[PDB]
Specification:
Chains A, B, C, D, E: Keywords: Amyloid, Amyloidosis, Antimicrobial, Bacteriolytic enzyme, Disease variant, Disulfide bond, Glycosidase, Hydrolase, Secreted, Signal. The structure holds 5 chains of a larger assembly. The first copy, chain A, is an all-beta fold. Chain A has strands at residues 2-3, 18-22, 26-27, 32-33, 38-39, 42-43, 47-51, 60-65, 71-76, 79-89.
Amino acid sequence: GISLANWMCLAKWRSTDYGIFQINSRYWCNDGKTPGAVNACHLSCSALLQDNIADAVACAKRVVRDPQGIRAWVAWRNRCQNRDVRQYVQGC
Amino acid sequence: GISLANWMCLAKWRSTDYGIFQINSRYWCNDGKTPGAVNACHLSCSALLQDNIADAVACAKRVVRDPQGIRAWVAWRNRCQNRDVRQYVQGC
Amino acid sequence: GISLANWMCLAKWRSTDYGIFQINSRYWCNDGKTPGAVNACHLSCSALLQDNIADAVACAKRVVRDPQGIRAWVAWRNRCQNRDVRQYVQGC
Amino acid sequence: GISLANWMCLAKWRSTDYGIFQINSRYWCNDGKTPGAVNACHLSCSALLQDNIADAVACAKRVVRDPQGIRAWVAWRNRCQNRDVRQYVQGC
Amino acid sequence: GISLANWMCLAKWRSTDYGIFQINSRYWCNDGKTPGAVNACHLSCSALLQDNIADAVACAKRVVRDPQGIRAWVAWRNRCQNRDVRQYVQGC
């Protein structure tokens, strides 16, 4: 992931030292984010998958999906209609 | 994940030292986020999956999904209609 | 997850040292977040799944889903209609 | 992932030293991002997959998908129509 | 991934030294990005896949997809229509 380290040492027989660390930080910003909007989809025998990860830091993900065995998807004579469909997405 | 360490040491026989760490921090910001809005979908024999992770830090996720055995999805003569469908998504 | 450490040491035979750690913190901000809004969906023989994690720190998740054995989803002659459907999502 | 280290040392028998680290940080910015908007799709026996990762730092992802065994997708005489469909995406 | 290191040393028997590191940072910018908008697609027996990675730093991804075994996709006499379909994408 992330590893930081900061050291100082001295010996004897003025000083003003600075360490400033700023990784994912935001200052005076107007951030905005709008991932993954879905509208008016028709799914008959179908899959939709989304990872809408908006801001992760040092995050870990592990996935196993459908290792083994029969999948059958069958469709016939289905009727799907979208009419006058509008999507406005404005992550301003 | 995230590992930080800070050390200081001295020996003898002024000083003013600073350590500032700012990882995912937000200062004076106007952050806003709107992940994963879904509208008016028709699912017949269908799946929709979303990870709308908005801000995680050092988070860990482990998933196993449908390892083994028969899946069958069957659909016929279904009628699905959308009419005058509008989605407005505005993560300002 | 997250590990921090802070040390100081001295020996002999002024000083003013600082350690400031600010991980996921928010200062003076106007944060807002609106993950995962769902509207007017038709699920016939269907699944919808969402992880709307908004702000987690150091969080851990472990999942197992449908390891084994028959799934069958069957639909016929179903009628689904959406008419004049509007969704407004505004995570300002 | 990310590794940083900072050292200082001295011995004897003024000084003001600085270390500034700014990795993924944003200052005075008006950032905005809008990944992965989906509108009005028809999926008969079909898959749609999206990774809408908007801002990750040091993040790790591991995936296994459909290792083994029969997939069959069958569709016939399906009718799908889109009429007067408009999408506006404006990540300003 | 990314490795930084900073050292300082002295011995004896003024100084003001600076180290400024600015990797993926943005200053005074109006950045905006809008990857992967999808509109009005018809998928019969088909797959659509997107990685809409918008801003990753030091991120790692590993994927295994469909290692082994029969895939069959069959479609006949399907009718798909798009009419008056307009898409506007404006990552200003």
